Amino acid sequence: AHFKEYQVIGRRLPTESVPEPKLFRMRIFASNEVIAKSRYWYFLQKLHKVKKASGEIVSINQINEAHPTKVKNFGVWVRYDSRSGTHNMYKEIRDVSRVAAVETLYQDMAARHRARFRSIHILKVAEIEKTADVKRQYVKQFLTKDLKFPLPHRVQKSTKTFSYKRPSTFY
C-alpha cells in the first residue's frame, strides 16, 4: 500500500538469573503495525536466534518525515534473494519523503526486477546531503541550474463520447 515507517524495539523474555535482556531496534517500512511486527520477527530470527514465542515487542512507534515538503535525493541500498545468493543493488530516488522513496523503489522492483515485498530487503535509505555525491544520470539531469522543460503533445481527457471539434495537442 502507501508505506509508513516504524521503529520496532523488542527483546527476549526476562528469565531468572538473566534479567533485563538487551533491546533491539529496527526501522521497518510497512503498511500497518501488524505487517511491521511480522517483518521485525522475521528479521530478528534471521539475524539473532530470537523467536516470537521466546520474545516480546517492547515498543512500536511511527516515525514521521522530518521535513516532508523539502525535495531530497535518496540513496537506497537494497538486497534481494536469488538461488545463487543475495545480491546488492543501489538506486537513487528523488522525492520528498523516505516512505515515498521506498514506495517508488518497491514499484520499480516489481516493474523491472520482477521482485516482491517478501523478497526485497531494505538495507539503507540515506539522504545525499551534497549534490556532488549523486552518481546516477537520471537523477543528475534534474539538478541542472535553471531547469526548464516543456510537455509536448498534451492529451486532454474528454467527458463526452462525441466531440464537435478536432482536438489540439498544444500546451
Binding site: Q137, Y138, Q141, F142, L147, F149, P150, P152
Partner: protein, 191 residues
Amino acid sequence: MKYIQTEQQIEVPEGVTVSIKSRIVKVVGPRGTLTKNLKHIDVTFTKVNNQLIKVAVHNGGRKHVAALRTVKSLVDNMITGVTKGYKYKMRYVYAHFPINVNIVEKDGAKFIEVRNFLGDKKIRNVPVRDGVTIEFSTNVKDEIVLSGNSVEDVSQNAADLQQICRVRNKDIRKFLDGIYVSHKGFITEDL
C-alpha cells in the same frame, strides 16, 4: 534513460537562408534551392541567429536521438549542396567491346543510353533524375560526371548507372567491364 533534452547545432554560411515551418525545410543558396520533408520525425527546430539553428528532442530515447543526429546531417547535406554542390565522377572500362555512352531525349526526358556492353544488342536506358546534369569529361578517356545540388539524387543516379551494367553468369575475377564511381567531391574547386 529518457534524457530530458538532446540537441544538435546546424551552422549556416553567409549566403544561405533556411526556412522551417512544420518540419518542411527550404534551403536557399547561391546554387539554388532544396526542399526536405521531415514530418516523419518528432523534432523541434529553433533559430538562435542567422548563423546557428538548433534541432532538439525532448524526453526522447535512443532511436529518437539517433534520428536527431540524422536530421542534423541531412540539413547539413542540403546546405553543402546549395553552397558547393556535389560532383560524382564515374569511369567505364572494357576488355574487348567498347562501351558506348550517349545522352538521348525520349520525349524530352533525358535518358543515358548504354550500348555494346560486353557485345550486348540490348540498349540500356537510365533516366536522368531532375536536378542533376550529366557531362562527358574532356581530355579524360571514358569518364562521366554527374553534378547537382542534391547528393541523394546524384549518388542514386550514379548507383543506377553502375547497376545497369551488372555482369551476369560470368566470373567477375575475369570479366572486369563495367561503369564504376571513381571519385566523389564538390562542384566548387576554387582552392
